[PDB]
Symmetry: D2
Subunit: 121 residues, 4 copies
């Protein structure tokens, strides 16, 4: 059991639902606490499907481009992190958010931050 | 356009297809690190970019497991495609390795890659 | 309110004085509190922040050399001080190690630290 | 090899003195012909680097306030100096702006710059 498939929450009011395939694929959706369709976006990613057995976390990453049928922010976020299992399972990530810019504004195109996701809201 | 074969400054090879739905699919071969042969990638891009001269936002993930090796890590690239006489994809990236909790502070490398359609070998 | 003793989530200790000009000076060490683990730090902060509830931007550097050890590396922290009932400094950091040219792609780690005036 | 004037490709200049105690001190000029574009910088470097071809680790901070302007932000650069006939300082940087708590998630930009001893 990879423990990754299911619904995950951050503390800022966001939810994502992911399926972890046997081949290393991550597929799902990223949405708001609200759950309205205008706030739901496609996500795709990859994870290590044969992690080490010594207590290390499971490395993974995924991308959301912030376009759906209703809105387009001309940007994309990537999260890079690891899953840590157990009774208090969590995904610890750092992320990069890049917006489309002109070349003169490219120096300010990319934000960086961190997010932790848990199975309980 | 984004579909094609790209090379970064280290000689790594990025073969990608951009789908009409915003999907990126393809393979990645790294010239550096604990890696051999090709790895699956998946990602997303803005399929309706702004018309004001801004670049096209995108991102993708590779988990560093294939049939030959497993590095227990994953890299995400976040960036934009800039069309023109010499098209380029400018990225920043995060590489996370699976670690124990005591080593999680040193789990994540950061860097930047530039891709072009001409090999700078 | 920046001047004083601060601790991060891992037990390291940050002793800093903020000057009227914008200067940060002090020492950075581990929880063990031995002399071998203490390093000089220098940095800068916004000495006239906005009055709309925003934090105070700041940053500082430690090179990991002292009279006992040299790791051939340096960390910079970039963040903001948030005043109030529970004072906090929220940061992200970059640690760069000296490398050969062929290894420069793996020279730099990134992470985040939260400091408070009370030990974790 | 660090002391002197360095240029990036975007039109900035900085002049730095590397002290024997590991200090970096100097001025950062964001625009070529503007005196209201000069800011204090302070940092640290490895004063005893390896002699095997590795670079020299360093970092520094500018807070974007002077006697004329205040952007309520600060940048830290973390990187290494590489010597030789075409000397360079290769960095990654973090820029944090003071925000309210509700906007702290978008407080920090990340990027990279390369400095050389000759103008681009």
């Amino acid at each position: 059991e990879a423990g990754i498939t299911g619904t995950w929450y951050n503390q800022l009011g966001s939810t994502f639902i992911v399926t972890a395939g046997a081949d290393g694929a991550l597929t799902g959706t990223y949405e708001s606490a609200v759950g309205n369709a205008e706030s739901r976006y496609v996500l795709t990613g990859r994870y290590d499907s044969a992690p080490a057995t010594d207590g290390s976390g499971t490395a993974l990453g995924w991308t959301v481009a912030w376009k759906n049928n209703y809105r387009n922010a001309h940007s994309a976020t990537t999260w890079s992190g690891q899953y840590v299992g157990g009774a208090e399972a969590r995904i610890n990530t750092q992320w990069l958010l890049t917006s489309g810019t002109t070349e003169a504004n490219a120096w300010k195109s990319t934000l960086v931050g961190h997010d932790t996701f848990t199975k309980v809201k």
